[PDB]
Curated annotation (Swiss-Prot):
Effect noted on mutating K80D: Significant suppression of the pdeH disruption motility phenotype, less binding to FliG
Disruption phenotype: No visible motility phenotype. Disruption of this gene suppresses the reduced motility of a pdeH disruption, thus the double disruption is motile.
An individual GO BP term: negative regulation of bacterial-type flagellum-dependent cell motility
Ranges of residues in domain PilZ: 111-213
Entry-linked Pfam families: PilZ (PF07238), PilZN (PF07317)
Family under the similarity heading: Belongs to the YcgR family.
Protein name: Flagellar brake protein YcgR
């Protein structure tokens, strides 16, 4: 795929830095190709070698090995990483199976989020009616100045809503004009992504304050871990 060209790393040391960081942090890697996917890990990296853990499933390992053009994505703090390799070949690392490949000559280091996102806790409830007058309810997952993630029905990306209630318990209750911008999966549990519409400056300051206090509270409690 493609992202803003500012996100594309091409300097070999640039590409390598990002990869060494995935390794040192043990970030899970998601391999996908035409017809399958599997979770792996960066086991070791040199300028000439990428070594990836085998998958858990013998069938996925057989199917990666005959694939071409394999996309690898990883989710780190503050970024999404993504690159492609032409093929994986079997090897051994520390006496156990592994995939080896030449590193990609380029990689995406994707950082599109303008606003900080804080995770919701003890769960917070939300609810809205649908065009057929039933009531959709879901659990808030995370929160930013411009939107919210929710965990759970037949809906469609692009759906716009108007009066969506957010009971954040001890803090208080609010609503927003939000648009369902992404339906995905999270563990087989479905996940919604909302961007807020028509957020007045008054509400912006409210959202700022709540996000602040939740962050500060996590800080205070974790200090208390002492
Ligand atoms: N349209 C839209 N959809 C959103 C937005 N936020 C979350 N989603 C949807 O929710 C899925 C999961 O987001 P996540 O848990 O933060 O999990 C994300 C997050 O860890 C990371 N990621 C992707 N892009 C970025 C980024 O630009 N910045 C950061 N820091 N992480 C990113 O990769 C994971 C998977 O990303 P996806 O495959 O795209 O899958 C995303 C996407 O379908 C958004 O602002 N707009
Ligand atoms: N807490 C929370 N807030 C959400 C969620 N989804 C959307 N928002 C809010 O909605 C704003 C605009 O979303 P957008 O139009 O998809 O525009 C997004 C989208 O195009 C893209 N993007 C950011 N993160 C992701 C991601 O994880 N996956 C994908 N596919 N796209 C992303 O970058 C643009 C800017 O991202 P932001 O500055 O963060 O701005 C986001 C964020 O403030 C969510 O799941 N959780």
């Amino acid at each position: 795929s493609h992202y803003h060209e500012q996100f594309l790393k091409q300097n070999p040391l640039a590409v390598l830095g990002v990869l060494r960081d995935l390794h040192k942090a043990a970030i899970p890697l998601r391999l996908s190709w035409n017809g399958g996917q599997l979770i792996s890990k960066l086991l070791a990296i040199t300028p000439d070698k990428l070594v990836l853990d085998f998958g858990s499933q013998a069938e996925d390992n057989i199917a990666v090995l005959k694939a071409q053009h394999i996309t690898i994505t990883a989710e780190t703090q503050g970024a999404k990483v993504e690159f492609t390799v032409e093929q994986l070949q079997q090897s051994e690392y520390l006496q156990l199976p592994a995939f080896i490949t030449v590193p990609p000559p380029t990689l995406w280091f994707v950082q599109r989020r303008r606003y900080f996102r804080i995770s919701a806790p003890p769960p917070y409830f939300c609810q809205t009616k649908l065009a057929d007058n039933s009531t959709l309810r879901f659990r808030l997952y995370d929160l930013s100045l411009g939107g919210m993630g929710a965990l759970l029905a037949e809906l469609q990306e692009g759906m716009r809503f108007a009066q969506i209630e957010v009971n954040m318990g001890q803090w208080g209750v609010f609503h927003f004009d939000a648009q369902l911008i992404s339906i995905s999966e999270r563990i087989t549990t479905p996940r919604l992504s909302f961007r807020f519409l028509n957020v007045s400056p008054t509400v912006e300051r409210q959202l700022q304050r709540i996000i602040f206090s939740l962050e500060r509270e996590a800080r205070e409690k974790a200090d208390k871990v002492r």
